[PDB]
Amino acid sequence: NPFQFYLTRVSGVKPKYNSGALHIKDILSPLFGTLVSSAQFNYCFDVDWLVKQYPPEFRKKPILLVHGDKREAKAHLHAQAKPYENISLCQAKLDIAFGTHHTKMMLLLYEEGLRVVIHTSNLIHADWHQKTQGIWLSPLYPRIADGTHKSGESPTHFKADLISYLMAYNAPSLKEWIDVIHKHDLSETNVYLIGSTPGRFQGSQKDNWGHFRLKKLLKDHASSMPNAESWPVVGQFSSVGSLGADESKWLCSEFKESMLTLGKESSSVPLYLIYPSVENVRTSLEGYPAGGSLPYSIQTAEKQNWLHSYFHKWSAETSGRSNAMPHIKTYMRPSPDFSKIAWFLVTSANLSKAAWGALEKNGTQLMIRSYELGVLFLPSAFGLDSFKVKQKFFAGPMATFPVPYDLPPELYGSKDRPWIWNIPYVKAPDTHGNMWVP
Ligand SMILES: O=C(O)c1cnc2c(S(=O)(=O)O)cccc2c1O
């Protein structure tokens, strides 16, 4: 494979379904590089657990934790990290209300070079235990020789785009990492960076972030095909924000319109949304506690029942993960028979205006509340017109993309309901014999 897209290891599936998978100990292993220093961007941290995932010989190397916690949450994180003298913290500024820092990324500085990891898991045991999570592993980026003047840029502009993403924090600890990235050659990168940073973007900055960034990339670097209107859009996520009183308010107006974009020319395109049903959660490896990480509240859900008619069950026979609840988020553009895809995105961004941006000020301003990060796989970046969909995720031309769940997605049945995490489920017990009583 040239794609370097991986799933996390799942405890309890047969070895065939973990052979190509990565645990965090694998990512941090000396086999990937001799660690000098690392930055861990995330949302939730268990610092004691996290340090144990580094190899013992690397556990005292400097670690920067990049988080968005404030007030007592911030105090708790500092208290977690105080026992470890090698850990520094960077509080990402969140100057827009209800914003959060969801970006999940490792910067791994080695003796031998630099690696970037963009993924979907929190740095806590349960996010790596029995969930479906996604990982993109960059190549080993070599250092540019001192005195040599080259860009180290890729055809996808990844180096400049990653620096741009880090510059938005205005953070001194991240300027140090910007200087590290400047000194490395990222030219082999074949993915496009799609980030969200908090702010209100107009004019020349509108296209930098969120769903407008996606739109711009798809306009510039994808081709429209005949009967493009028949190629569905698939969104797959683990949380849902408040999208409005009907589909025209945001989902099908600006969000779907960005995702439909192909090529530079000026809708009945089917939209499949994949989100675990109650039954998916009940019968999962974790049982009802998997719903602890699917934080769709009844208060939000009751305001937008129109949305649930778009919902499809989680199903992942292709990767043996139908019972490993998703915390990965993915978006893609399959062909009408789901045999090909025009692009694939793995990201931290859930289906929310906070994550993707919402137009304001008469359509002239894109307001984003949160930090998010993902990578976009475009066929043009691999010298292809489309990706073939890999039939078995862990099977054996290497130019077929490993989609981690089943296509076509399966609509909710009439008795199915979306997992809603703050109501009780006491009709049927889960795989551990328990009910769900919040
Ligand atoms: O991956 C993330 O960044 C993320 C963020 N938030 C979560 C919440 S909640 O803080 O929104 O209540 C509840 C359960 C899981 C969450 C999660 O996985």
From Swiss-Prot:
The keyword Thylakoid appears for this protein: no
Record has Nuclease as a keyword: yes
Record's comment on post-translational modification: Phosphorylated on serine and/or threonine residues, but not on tyrosine residues.
Effect annotated for changing residue 102 to A: Loss of activity
Site location (Interaction with DNA): 352
UniProt-reported outcome of changing residue 327 to A: 3000-fold reduction in activity; abolishes hydrolysis of the covalent intermediate between the active site nucleophile and DNA
Localization in the cell: Nucleus; Cytoplasm
Binding-site residues, substrate: 104, 329
GO MF annotation, one: double-stranded DNA binding
Record-level GO BP terms: DNA repair; double-strand break repair; single strand break repair
Active site: 102 (nucleophile), 327 (proton donor/acceptor)
Renumbered residue ranges of the record's region Interaction with DNA: 239-242
Name of the molecule in the record: Tyrosyl-DNA phosphodiesterase 1
Organism: Homo sapiens (Human)
Taxonomic lineage from the root: Eukaryota, Metazoa, Chordata, Craniata, Vertebrata
Residue span relative to the full protein: 162 to 607 of 608
